[PDB]
Amino acid sequence: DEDVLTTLKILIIGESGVGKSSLLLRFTDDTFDPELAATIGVDFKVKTISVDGNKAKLAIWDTAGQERFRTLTPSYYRGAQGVILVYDVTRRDTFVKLDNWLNELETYCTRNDIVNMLVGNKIDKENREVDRNEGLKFARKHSMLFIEASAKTCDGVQCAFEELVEKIIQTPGLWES
Numbered sequence: 001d002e003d004v005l006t007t008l009k010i011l012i013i014g015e016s017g018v019g020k021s022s023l024l025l026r027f028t029d030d031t032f033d034p035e036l037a038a039t040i041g042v043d044f045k046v047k048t049i050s051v052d053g054n055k056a057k058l059a060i061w062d063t064a065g066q067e068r069f070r071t072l073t074p075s076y077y078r079g080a081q082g083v084i085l086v087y088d089v090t091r092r093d094t095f096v097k098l099d100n101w102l103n104e105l106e107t108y109c110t111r112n113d114i115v116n117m118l119v120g121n122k123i124d125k126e127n128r129e130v131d132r133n134e135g136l137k138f139a140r141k142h143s144m145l146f147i148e149a150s151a152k153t154c155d156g157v158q159c160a161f162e163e164l165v166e167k168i169i170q171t172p173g174l175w176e177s
């Protein structure tokens with residue numbers, strides 16, 4: 001790790017079934033599992049990437065969307081530097097519930113510079129319920145980055161993680177050791 005600038009804690013949150021774990025598997029393993037199992041507790045994965053000429057090691061916390069499967073919730077948020085909030089563009093309920101997730105995240109307000117990225121997933125699917133502009137409006141109202149993605153067809157996945165990391169490195173007090 002002699003060329004690694006820093007290790008960043010990235011949290012992935014959002015309702016069950018929106019594709020959190022699939023976005024992560026696409027990013028770490030370059031594959032998709034149509035039958036991926038629901039996450040129980042937290043699934044931690046490490047991946048190192050390069051953005052703007054710097055290598056950042058990502059410690060990624062993929063959490064269960066079902067509240068009954070979450071434990072030590074304060075631990076999930078503690079130290080997070082980037083947060084990816086995910087909704088399913090085919091399920092309006094998962095988009096409206098992002099307000100509950102944001103309320104939770106805002107109780108872990110030690111710093112006010114954590115970088116948030118909103119991802120509307122499953123854009124490959126039929127029967128979209130949330131349009132892109134609606135997701136963009138929410139992101140901008142909350143000063144978040146925004147991307148639409150498909151873990152299934154790869155659209156937007158790499159950018160969701162790269163754009164988040166680029167911005168975290170450009171917010172110095174956030175990662176300086």
Ligand SMILES: Nc1nc2c(ncn2[C@@H]2O[C@H](COP(=O)(O)OP(=O)(O)NP(=O)(O)O)[C@@H](O)[C@H]2O)c(=O)[nH]1
Nearest residue numbers: 016017018019020021022034038039065122151152
């Ligand atoms: N068509 C399509 N299906 C997807 C996409 N992303 C995930 N899925 C599917 O949607 C289902 C749930 O995905 P998953 O990644 O497990 O969701 P999750 O947000 O991690 N759920 P949990 O919070 O319960 O762990 C899975 O069967 C998976 O194949 C996508 O971009 N497009």
Ligand SMILES: [Mg+2]
Nearest residue numbers: 020021038039
């Ligand atoms: Mg999962």
